[PDB]
Amino acid sequence: FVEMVDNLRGKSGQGYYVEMTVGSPPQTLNILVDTGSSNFAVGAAPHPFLHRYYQRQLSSTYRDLRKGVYVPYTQGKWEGELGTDLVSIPHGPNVTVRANIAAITESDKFFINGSNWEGILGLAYAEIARPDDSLEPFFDSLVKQTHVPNLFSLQLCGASVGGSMIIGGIDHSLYTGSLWYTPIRREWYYEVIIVRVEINGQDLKMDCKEYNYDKSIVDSGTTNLRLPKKVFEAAVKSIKAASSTFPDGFWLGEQLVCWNIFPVISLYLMGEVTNQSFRITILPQQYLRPDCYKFAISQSSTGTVMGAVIMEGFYVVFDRARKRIGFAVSACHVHDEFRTAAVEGPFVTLDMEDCGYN
Ligand SMILES: Cc1cccc(-c2ccc([C@@H]3C[C@@H]3c3cc(=O)n(C)c(N)n3)cc2)c1
């Protein structure tokens, strides 16, 4: 899948985007790759910050679904007008598909002043599609209308950033060692189960249910590694102890600071087999973001969010066909001379089911 290697671009902190075309003739747009949502939505009006937008009036293949959508989220929101049209991906598979498209008509704190993307591609499942599961997501529509295998993978590499979205398969050149797989728990977000956490090899020893309170997901849409309040509290306390060789606001992402004094962080994830897990390990070069750095770990109320902090350490395979997600050491991650990002197993971990939440 070399046709698709390096098909992702971005600016530090503004997400990864992939080139797409909408309509006939085809209108090129940059679209942010978001495994944390399920809507395909593009700017359709001349917002001041946009470089380009979907002009439905120029598209012969556009169809109106005569319905609107309102997507509040943490801060702020987008609204748009539902329709369908022919979507293609220049550096993806050689296909065209009729997909649902929210034409974004009003917006608040959604588009970024400075960025180079004007739409979002939600890669998660129908269950969290807006306004409801009846709105078939792009990838569901892709697989239905073609022989493209039900699978995609991302290697996020990280002003300018880059990466690869391999649609329909796996590019082995993008990783080293073996892939290890965690089960997708429920097909809405990409939910998984964290079974253990270690800072510099030292278990946090928390009820593992607290690691998935009330959710843990894989989110290319997030920059941070985001932990639930309790966990993060313990997480940071332990990171602080490890790093005894900084002001409290910093740890809270209220201020900035300006490698080896820092502890590697390990997540054990539920394995494919009963009482079996594996672990992914990241370096400070990953949770310390650019000499001023931001502490890229942060408390959360929505659960654990495995964002670019995690994802930029690994080649991540979203194997929808088998309801599972694989992690491999990324052949691009930034590592120094001593520590390296790692994916290791198997381990024996009892009672992994209990780490889940209901
Ligand atoms: C990394 C980055 C930078 C700038 C903007 C975003 C971004 C902005 C909006 C969204 C749309 C609302 C849905 C959404 C909201 C949201 O809060 N998250 C974490 C995700 N993954 N998706 C998704 C991602 C993401």
Domain 149-358 belongs to what topology?
Cathepsin D, subunit A; domain 1 (2.40.70)
Domain ranges, ordered by start, for the chain: 16-148, 149-358
Q: Is the CB of 107 under 6 A from ligand 1?
A: no
Distance from Cα 177 to the centre of ligand 1, integer Å: 31
**φ and ψ at residue 340, rounded to 5 degrees:** -135, 155
Compute, in angstroms, the gap from residue 301 CA to the centroid of ligand 1. Answer: 16
Resolution, Å (one decimal) = 2.5
Residues ending a continuous segment of the chain before a break (C–N > 2.5 Å)? 158, 245, 258, 290
Same-fold call for 16-148 versus 149-358: yes
Distance 349 CA to ligand 1 centre (A): 33
> Taking CA 224 as the corner, what is the angle to CA 111 and CA 332, rounded to the nearest 5 degrees?
100
Instruction: Give the type of residue at 319.
Output: D
Whether the CB-CB separation of 80 and 69 falls below 8 Å is answered with yes
H, E, C per residue of the chain: CHHHCCCEEEECCCCEEEEEEECCCCEEEEEEEECCCCCEEEECCCCCCCCCCCCHHHCCCCEEEEEEEEEECCCCEEEEEEEEEEEECCCCCCCCEEEEEEEEEEEECCCCCCCCCCEEEECCCHHHCCCCCCCCCHHHHHHHHCCCCCCEEEEECCCEEEEEEEECCCCHHHEEEEEEEEECCCECCEECCEEEEEECCEECCCCHHHHHCCCEEECCCCCCEEEEHHHHHHHHHHHHHHCCCCCHHHHCCCCCECCCCCCCEEEEEECCCCCEEEEEEECHHHHEECCCEEECEEEECCCEEECHHHHCCEEEEEEHHHCEEEEEEECCCCCCCCCCCEEEEEEECCCHHHHCCC
Mutate to test the pocket of ligand 1, among 31, 33, 37 (most ligand atoms within 8 A of CB): 37
Q: What is the largest CA-CA distance in the chain?
A: 64
Q: Whose CA is nearest to atom 8 of ligand 1?
A: 110
Task: Give the residue, out of 73, 191, 215, with the most ligand 1 atoms within 8 A of its beta carbon, to mutate for a pocket test.
Answer: 73
Nearest CA to ligand 1 atom 15: 73
Q: Which CATH code fits 16-148?
A: 2.40.70.10
Give CA–CA dist 8/152, Å, rounded. Answer: 14
CA distances from 103 to 11, 45, 67, 68 (A): 24, 8, 11, 9
CA 46 to chain centre: 28
Cis peptide before 131 (omega within 30 of 0): yes
Ligand 1: centre distance to CA 243 (Å) = 32
